[model samples]
Target: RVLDVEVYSSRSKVYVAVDGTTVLEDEAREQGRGIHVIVLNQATGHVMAKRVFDTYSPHEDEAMVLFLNMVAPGRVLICTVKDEGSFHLKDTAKALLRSLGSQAGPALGWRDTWAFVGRKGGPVFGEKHSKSPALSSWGDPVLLKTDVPLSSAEEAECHWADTELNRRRRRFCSKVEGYGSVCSCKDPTPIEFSPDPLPDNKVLNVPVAVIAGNRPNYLYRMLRSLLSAQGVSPQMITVFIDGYYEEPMDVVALFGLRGIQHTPISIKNARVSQHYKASLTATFNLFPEAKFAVVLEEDLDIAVDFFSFLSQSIHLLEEDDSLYCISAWNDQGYEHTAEDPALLYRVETMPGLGWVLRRSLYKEELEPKWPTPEKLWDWDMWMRMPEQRRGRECIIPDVSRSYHFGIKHKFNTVPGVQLRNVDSLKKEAYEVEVHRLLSEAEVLDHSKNPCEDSFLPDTEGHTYVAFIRMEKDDDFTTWTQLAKCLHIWDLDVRGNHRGLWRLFRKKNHFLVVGVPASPYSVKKPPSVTPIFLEPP
Candidate 1:
C-alpha cells in the first residue's frame, strides 16, 4: 500500500490531504471547530471513514470513543484539530487514541493544534504526530508519506502494541519538559517550514511591548496589523494599556493578546512617557533572557516586512556602538520622497514611531533617568534630545517601515517594493551592499530644476547627491533654509553614512554631506564630488 497524508490545524480551519488529493478542506467544513479524523484501510489505500468530533460536547466525545473502538486493527487513523478539540474530551477517548499509537492526545490542551497518523494495531514505535503549544497561532503542517508493504507475510512480521510498554513510554515522555509527547515516535516530516520559527509560533525571542492609550479603535487596528504581520506570535507581545479601561482590554482579549493595565496618570504627556517606561521595564523584567526588545504604540500601522526588517537589521545594533536604536519611522518619509525598500540610513535623532533598543541600553542608561511621570516633555522628544542621545545615532528606512495616523498623509505604499532578504546575507555582505549604494550614487546637481531634474534620478546608470550641514561650526541658519527648500526635517540632525547625511526626494536616493565649513566638506568622498555652494 502507498499513502501520503497531510494535516494542518489553526484556530480558523483544519485541512487534510491524502495521497496528493484533498480529502478535507477548510472551506467545505465550515464549523471550523473540533477534531477531524479520517480512517484509511492500509491494505487498499482507501478512506474508510471521514468524521469530525466536537470535543466541547461530552456526548460527541463518547461518540468519538465508540467510533475509534469500531475501527479495525491495522487500519490507519489521520486526525487533526480545527478551532479546539480538548474541552470536554474524555479520558476514555484519550486512552483509546493512546491505543492507536497516539503520543500527543493525552496531553492535548484546549485549542492546541495536533495532527496524527497511526495504525490501530501494534507498531507502538512508528506513530507519526505533530502538536503546537496551546494559545499559539498554529502548528507547522504535518505530513506522513510512506510506502506500505502489500505482502501479507511482511505485514505479519510487524510487531503490534505492548500495553505495559506503551504505558511506560507515554508516562516517561509526558514527564519530560520541553520534549513534547512524540517521545521518539516517528514524527511526520513537515512539507515546508515557515521563514522563522521560535518557541510556539513566536517569530522573535525579543518581547514586543505595545503602548496603549484611550484610543480603542486605533489599538484594535494596530494590534490587528501587528498580529497579521508575518512572523508575529501573540505570546511574545504585551499590550500595556494606560489607565484601567474595558474597551481596550476587550480588544486585547478579542485578539488573545496579553495586556497590562495601569492606573491612570493625570498628565497626558506624563502618561505617555510613563507607559513607554513601564512597557520597556516589563519587557526586560518578564523576559530576562531577551537581549533586545521592541516597542510600538497602538497608533501605528506596521508594514508587512516589520519583523523581517528588524530581524535582518538587529545585528547592526548589536555590532555597532555608535548606533542607539533602530526606528520604523522617518520624519521625512513621504510618498513623494521615500521609495526604496533596501535603503537604510543612520540618523542622529531618535525617530520613535516603532523601535527596538538594547537591554543594556535600557537597564544601564535610560532606566535610572527615565522621565518622571510629571515631566512635561514628550517621551520621544526627550529621548531625541542630544543629551540623552549622547551623539549616538539611530537607523531608519528610506521608506518608513511603519505609518502613523496621528497621522498619515506621509508614508505611502510602493505596491511591489520589498526589502532585500538581508537576513541570509552575512553581516559583512550587508555592510558591503550599504557601502556600494553610497559609493556609486551620483552627485546631486543644484543647478538643475529642483523638482524636475534635481530630485530622484532612477535612470539605469544615473543617480544624484545632496548635502546637509551637521558639524558644530556649520552655518545652522543656512542649513535650515536649505532644509525648508528641500521639504525635509530641519529641526534636528538626521541621517549620515560615512559622514554624509542620507535623505530621499521624489523617490530617488540623495546623499547630503556638510558645507565647506564642516567635517562633511565636499572634498571628502570621491563618490560625492557634488559641488558645495558657498555660505549665503
Candidate 2:
C-alpha cells in the first residue's frame, strides 16, 4: 500500500510529469486548502519529488503517475506523506489490490531520509531512477469486485490499481501519445461614440494634441469620443501622424476630420520614445497660442465631461507652480494610487495615459529633455526624474477621466511588433460624477474664453448645388453650432464626375465628399466661425 496526504487546494488534483500527461481528477478549481501540483524534471530542489511538489503546494502527481504506469509500469509509488490520511489510504489500497488478486507485500520502513523513498525500501532519489516504478515494475495492475469498505463521509478518496487495468491504461497511453486529443477545444458602430450638450453648457477654448499612429480604428474612436465630449469642440485639434509601414492618411482625408491637423514624421519609422518627443514639441510649435493643450493617444475613450475637467484644471496648472501636467489617468486604477477629493491633487510622478500639457512648461522642461535613444527611455517616467525635471509635481484626478481600450482590441499583440494589453473599463459611477462637476462648475466664461459664435468644424468642406437638403448634416451643424457656421459644402457625390474635387467627412461614419477633397475645392464663404488651416 502506498499513501500520501495532499492539502487539497481546490484544483481538485494536479498532475504533470515531464514524461506524463494529465489525468482527470474529481475536484473543483476553487480556492480551498492549497494543494498545488507541479511537474518538473525533478532534478529540482535537492532531488526531492514529494517535498518539492508539496512545497510548491499541491503536486503534478496524477499525470506523472498515469504516464509512468503506461510507459514505465514496473514503477513503484512515492507516498511520503506526513499526515493522518495515509493509514486509511493504505487500507483501501490493500483491500483493492488483494481483490484483483495482485501480490501485496508487507510494509517496510527505511531511514528517516523519507526525504527520498521508494517501494523497494531504498534511497531512490535522483534523476537516474526518476521514472515512477509502482504500477509498471510489477505485472498488470489488479482490480476485481473487491470487497473494500468504500465510502462513509471521509472514506471516498482511497483506491487501488486493478490487475487487468494495466493493459487498458497502456492502450490508452499508446493512443494518446500517438494521436493528440481535443478536450472540447472550443473557443462598434461608432459614428458618435457619445453625445451631448456640455456641462454648464461651457465649451473649451482648447485644442487637442493627438498622436496618431497605425491604428486608425482606434484613432477614429478617439476622435469620435472627443467630438462627443461635453463642451469640447472638434476644431483645431492637431494630430501628429507618426510613420508606419503604410503611408497613412486615409482616415484623415476620408473622414474630413474637422479638428484633426495632420503632421507627418520627423523620425522615419519612429521609435516609441522619439514619436512622443516630436509630437509634444510639435504640438506647442503648432498651437502655441492656446493656453492649455489636451494630449491624447489613438486608443482611448474620454469621459463625457473630459474637457470640462481639463477646462477646469487649467487654472490649477497655472496657479500651482509645482504642477508639471494634468493627468487624466489615475495610473493605478482602483489601486492605492492616491488622489485627493478636492477635484485634483499633486503628485511627483508623471502618469500619462491621457494628459494635458502646459504649453509653457513643456517648452521649458519637457521639450529640452525630450526623449533620445540614450537620454530618456520612457517619456512618461523621464518627466519624473529629479535631475531631468527639477522636482515638479503633476495635477491628477480622483478617478480617471478616460478609459483605455487597447486591451480589448489587442493592439500590438497580434503575433508581432507592438505594445501590450491594458485595463480599461467604464466606471460608470465616476464618469457620472464628472458630468455632474461640469454641470455644476461656476458658469462664467470670461471675455478671454468666450463662447465664440459656434462655427462649422474644419473637416474637408466643398460646395455644389443641392438636390435635396442633408437633414442629418443640417442637424449636426445646428446642434453642435460649430457645424452650421462652416461653408457647409453641397459637393455633388452622385454626378460630380469630371474630378472637379473630392470630399470626406464623418457625419456618422466615413463619407468622402470628393475622392479625397482639400485637393480641389472652392472654399465656401468665410464666416464669424473660422476654419483652422494647416500650419503654413
Candidate 3:
C-alpha cells in the first residue's frame, strides 16, 4: 500500500494509497513513530486496513515516493500534509510533481522595463503592456544562468509559476495596476503630473451656515476670509442682526461687492439685547438644512488656516455623537498633554468666541429661551446648562484666539449696576467709601444686629451726604477742613488687625469714610448711647 504523511509543527498524520486509491487514514500523535503501513481492498468490506510498523526512519522526500507506490496505476491517490517551518519538508513537496512524471517546467526570467503613452495635449505614460507596435508583436528574450540541477530547476520553476499566477490573480482582482511605477523597475524615469486645477465655476454642494452681526467691517472681514477658504464663499454667509439696530445697508453692499449672496435675519425681542441672541436664533433657523453651523462674532480675528481647522473639527465631531459643542477659542488655561492636541476635549463649558454646534442638538436640546431677570446674559444662560450636557461641550486648542472689542458690559465686570465711566472720580470715591464701610462693618460684627437696624434715627427722611474734596500731592494749601472731616481709617486702629494686615500686604494704608451733612458732623452731638453686640 502507498503511504503519505502530512507533518505540521507539532503533529503528523498518515494515509495509505493502493491501486492509486486512498484506502486508509490515521493520525500519528507521536514524533519518531515508525510509518504505519496499511492495506485494504475497496471491493470487499472484510479487508483489514491495519498499521504495520516500519524499521527505518524515512526522509520527507523519500516518503512521497513510498506514498506514490502504494497507489498503483489502475486507481488515483491523494494525500494532504501541513508544511511546518521545516525547509526540507517544503523542498520535498516541490520535488513531488517531477517524481510523479509531470511535464518539464518552463524557464523563468524578469527584466526591468516600463512603457509610456500620451493623452490630451500632453504625453501620458505608464499605460498598456508595450510602448510601440514592434515591441508589442515580439521582443528578444534574455537567458539566465544558474548552477541548480535539472530536478531542482524544475521544482523551482513550478514554485515560481504558482507565485507569479497568484500575484497576477491578486492584481487583477484589485484592479490597481500601473497606478504608479514600481520603485525597483527601470527604463522610464517615473514622473508625476500636477493634478488639474478645479474650474472657476465649480460649486460644492455641502450644507453650511454662518453667524454674523452688526460691525460691518468685522462682518466684511469675516466674509472675505470665508470666501478665500478652500470650500466656502460669500453666498454661504448667513447674517443675524441683533437688537434694535437696523441692518447697515453699506455692510450688505460689501457682500455684493465681494460676489457673495447672504441671508439676513432680524430677531425681535426685548431680552435679545445684543447680537448673541440674534446669532443663536439664526443658527436655530438654519439647523434643519445645515446640520452644523459656525457662529462667528464680529470681533473675531481668524488665523489663515482657521477654515481648515474648522473643516476637520466639524467632520470629526459629526461622526462622534457624544460631542455637543466645538469651540474655536479655548480658555487661556487649557494646555495639551499626551492627548491629541487636535482632538476635542469634553469641557464643562466653552467660551462663546468662535464656536460650532450641531443644529439638531441646538434646536432639540439647547432651545433658546429668555433668561429670567436674574440670569439675563447669554453666557449666564449657557453656563446654567445641566452638568452632564455641559461636560460634552468641548474646545479645540488651536492657536486661533478671538479678541472682543466693545464697551465692557457691567454684568461681565460687576452685577446689577452699570458704570458710566469706570474710571470716573465719583466711581473711585464710591469704591473707596464702600471699601471703608465694609472694613468697619466687618470689625463691628453686624451679624448680631437686627436686619431693620437704622444707624441714623433722627430724620423724617434719610439724609443724603455728598462729600467732595480735592487735594494736590505737593500743596498743603489744598488740604481743607472738609477733607479732615472725611475720616481716613488708620490701618493701625484697634479691631482692624485683619484690615491692617491686608492693607500692609497690599501696600495700602489709607481708607475713605463718610461724615453726615447738616445736623451730623465729625464732632459729638448731645450724648447718646451706642448699640453693643454680644460676643460669639
Q: What lDDT score belongs to each candidate, Candidate 1 first?
A: 0.65, 0.38, 0.33
Candidate 3's displacement at residue 359, Å, is 1.4
RMSD of 3: 32.2
lDDT of 3 by residue, 1-536 (tens): 22221211112443433323545554546433432323222222112223332212336445544453433221111222211112233334335433433211001001111111111112221121211124223212111111111112222111222443334322221221111121112232212112222233222323334444455546545554544444454445555544333333234343342112234332342244334444555555544466666766556554434444555445445665655566655442122111122322333355566677666666666555434334445543454355425445453442333434433110011111221222211223323643443444312222232212232233331222122121222122212332222232212121111111111101112221222221112321223222222222
lDDT pick, better of 1 and 3: 1
| Model 1 error, position 387 (Å) | 3.0
In the order shown, the candidates' Cα RMSDs to the true structure are: 18.2, 24.9, 32.2
Better of 2 and 3 by TM-score: 2
C-alpha-based local distance difference test score of model 2: 0.38
Q: How close is candidate 3 to the true structure, as a TM-score?
A: 0.32
lDDT of candidate 1 over 1-536, digit per residue (tens): 45556666656666777668877777454584578887655555556567888886566888788767655456566777766788888788888878777878767776666777767685532334455554564454544444443325334222325544444433432222112222334451111114333222223688999988777758867886777566676678999998887657766765567889877665878777777787788889889999888889899987766776776678878777677898989776666566677767666678888998899989998989987876777888888777788878777877787888764325534322444653423334545665566577765655454434435565533445555444444345545555556667767645543455555555456656565554445344544343333335
Deviating ranges (above 4 Å) for candidate 3: 1-214, 243-247, 257-287, 333-345, 368-375, 380-384, 387-390, 401-536
Encode model 2's per-residue lDDT on 68-155: one tens digit a residue: 2322111222322121111122333334322222232112111111111122222232210011134222112111111111123212
Quote each prediction's TM-score. Answer: 0.55, 0.38, 0.32
Q: Which candidate, 1 or 3, would have the higher TM-score against the true structure? A: 1
